Ligand binder design. Sequence first.
Ligand SMILES: Nc1nc2c(ncn2[C@@H]2O[C@H](COP(=O)(O)OP(=O)(O)OP(=O)(O)O)[C@@H](O)[C@H]2O)c(=O)[nH]1
Ligand SMILES: CN[C@@H]1CCc2c(ccc(O)c2O)[C@H]1O
Lengths: 287, 334, 55, 239
Amino acid sequence: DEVWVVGMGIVMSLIVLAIVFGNVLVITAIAKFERLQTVTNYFITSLACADLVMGLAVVPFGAAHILTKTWTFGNFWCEFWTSIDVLCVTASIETLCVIAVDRYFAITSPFKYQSLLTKNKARVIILMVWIVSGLTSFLPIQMHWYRATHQEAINCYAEETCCDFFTNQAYAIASSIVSFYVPLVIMVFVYSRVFQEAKRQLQKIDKSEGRFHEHKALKTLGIIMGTFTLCWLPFFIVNIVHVIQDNLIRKEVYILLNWIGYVNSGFNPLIYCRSPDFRIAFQELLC
Amino acid sequence: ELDQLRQEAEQLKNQIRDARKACADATLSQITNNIDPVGRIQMRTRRTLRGHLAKIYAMHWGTDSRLLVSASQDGKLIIWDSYTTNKVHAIPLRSSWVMTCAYAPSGNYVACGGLDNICSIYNLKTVRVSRELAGHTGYLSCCRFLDDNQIVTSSGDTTCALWDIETGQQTTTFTGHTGDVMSLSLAPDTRLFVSGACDASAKLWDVREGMCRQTFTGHESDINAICFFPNGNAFATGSDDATCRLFDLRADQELMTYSHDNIICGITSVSFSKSGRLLLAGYDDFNCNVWDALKADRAGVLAGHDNRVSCLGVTDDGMAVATGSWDSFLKIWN
Amino acid sequence: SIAQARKLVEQLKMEANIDRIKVSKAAADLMAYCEAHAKEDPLLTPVPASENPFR
Amino acid sequence: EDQRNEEKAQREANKKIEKQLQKDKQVYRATHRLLLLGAGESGKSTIVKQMRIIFETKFQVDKVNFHMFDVGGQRDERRKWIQCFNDVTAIIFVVASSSYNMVIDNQTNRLQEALNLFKSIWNNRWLRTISVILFLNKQDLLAEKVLAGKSKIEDYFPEFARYTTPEDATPEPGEDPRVTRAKYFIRDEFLRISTASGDGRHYCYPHFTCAVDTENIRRVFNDCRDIIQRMHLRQYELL
Ligand SMILES: Nc1nc2c(ncn2[C@@H]2O[C@H](COP(=O)(O)OP(=O)(O)OP(=O)(O)O)[C@@H](O)[C@H]2O)c(=O)[nH]1
Ligand SMILES: CN[C@@H]1CCc2c(ccc(O)c2O)[C@H]1O
């Protein structure tokens, strides 16, 4: 029993450090140098900020709750922590969707991309994304609309030492639809169109000058799609499965999949910040 | 005959080379060995100017050490204000391709030129064009206001001219170069000036007489920049082989070369200081290096630009140095 | 042609007849000029913050 | 007092200068710049002419602004002003295809000089990321010379003996195999130089053009669109 506590703790601290360090480095590199301040990098900045907030707020407290197995703070802090977790999780995906849409516009509309996206519109888009993310996290949790109705939920809710997640079907469906399923089909369609563009361009080049001279697209699209899908897919299925009918999903599996979802934090800098200019920036400072 | 003409040329060059070799008593490094080095020099950015839509090729500090002008390929001349970092004027240009600009000593006129073989001047305090000078058969490289009525220009047709603004007609023309002329610098008394061509040579001219006086052929590649020592008996040049050489008018041969083994880039601008002890030169490595005039020892690096440096200037009072780069930004170092 | 060689040949003379001086005197003059105005230029010696207009 | 008055004077003028620039920044960023460059007697003025129905030109295609330059004032073998043209979208190259036997004062075949000029332009240090649109002008004189012509290309270019027509060639209907072979030999003579040191950062778009033609303006638009699309695809590591 003692061994499990020692092992679980080492993993949580390493995860927190890895989450914090990469996001802090990305933010510092973007802010310090004036060559990296473009329209595209603003979305990456917002994503990094949201991921840093999530990894600095909800991971240590969740680790304490699972290790100690007793919430020693008030119910108000439990509700606030749940609200922050939901807000960060639902705001760390719409930014990826916006980035995908931006790449779609850049690739498929090269002549009108400059006029379409300006520094004045990116701020509005980011503000709208953050507002719509926070509108579904604090509003239905600070207000008690997500509060359940069965006996176990009421029993835990009356107590001041247990902080678990109990929700009704309507919220469990609406939040999942807002967070995950809606921003998925858009990304799939966008990346399919981008792959078609790349394939046709490669075919044109090969037809034009093949006699003298698609692995690259797939390694990139496969990485980008697979990381996110494998990180966030099973949890957003069990979320609806365990509500549509009771006594199907154990709490341990739910918590394990939820914590698997958190690990996505440490991969965003490794995926969206691999440009050579970013490498030069990382070499300029702290090297 | 024609063969004799070659023969006559053959010895005169031998005589000149022998005389220059005999005049070499001792090297510069020997005499300047004893004096202590100035040590490391560190400069930090004080002001940053933004507002240009494209890369910058030219600038010129004002005589009041407060105002300056810059040119870019947007087709616009902007007269900044160093103290309060706010713009004063913005002059649209007929042609978007410009390579040089100048600021009148009296502070009333501004000139600019480019690919179009026309030198255009403007009236700041009346901003409309006042005169257009034509007659060259190539692009302009540099132009310096000799006075408020006459200007001297150098073009890409291996010639230089001394204009007259009031009449718009050339007064004297200078010939003798083979390659393109890229830069020039005037003496403090505006009696003599030099020019650096693309045939690896620099010549000293006489303004009033209009005849060449001396010739120097120390370099081995194109010459892009030229400066002039404040004493009035020396000048320095920068070339594409990453070498700076300090010539002398009285001796008529080079005295010392500035080079390092880790740089293989070119040189775009060369400037001195008020006392002439520091020689600042801009390179293609996106940074500027500071040398020591009498020792050829590096004493600092001016980094902070995101692209190559194409301009350099030091104020009349020597209070600050300003650099222009292709990143469309101007910086004031102190 | 024959004439162009003639101009270069005539000019090469004018340059050859100029009087010259030893390198030592030229170097000494530059040393004296640099030593005379050593304190003048702010670039060599950093100025106090009171008299600096760019701070 | 005066300091407040001077600042209210100076600050107001900056704001005005800033506003004018924002109006100019949009129109500056909207337009696309091109450079026209060719050898002597190539056909450059004529190609620019039917398009119409230092020298600068405005022409708009499908609500897109284009801007083309043709430099003729400076005529010299050494080109150093080329450093200013490293931010253009593309370079248009016009070469006379039918002048394979003229001699320029004695000098190599005119094509050989054009080939050397193209090789020098391609391998320039400052033009490492600039594409080239190639036009092979004078398409009818070449056919006239090939068909029932006393002069033979093998006399000037020895490599033609061991050169066969490509299997992927799609000649226009009605043309003899001989003109197709000559045309494709001329085209790959440039394609080899284009491909040798391309490094995957800029390509070439060869084309065939005669006097009676009116589709060049669409070809330039399509080539520019392809260039921008390829640049954007390569930037995100997708090509
Ligand atoms: N058959 C034919 N002749 C052409 C064509 N283009 C140009 N030419 C010939 O060339 C003439 C046009 O002038 P060019 O000598 O080509 O010169 P340019 O067009 O001014 O071009 P540059 O010499 O490069 O300045 C015409 O009168 C024709 O004799 C073409 O497409 N077909
Ligand atoms: C306890 N962790 C929470 C619980 C439910 C939930 C999450 C994320 C997004 C949602 O839309 C949710 O409804 C999880 O991060």
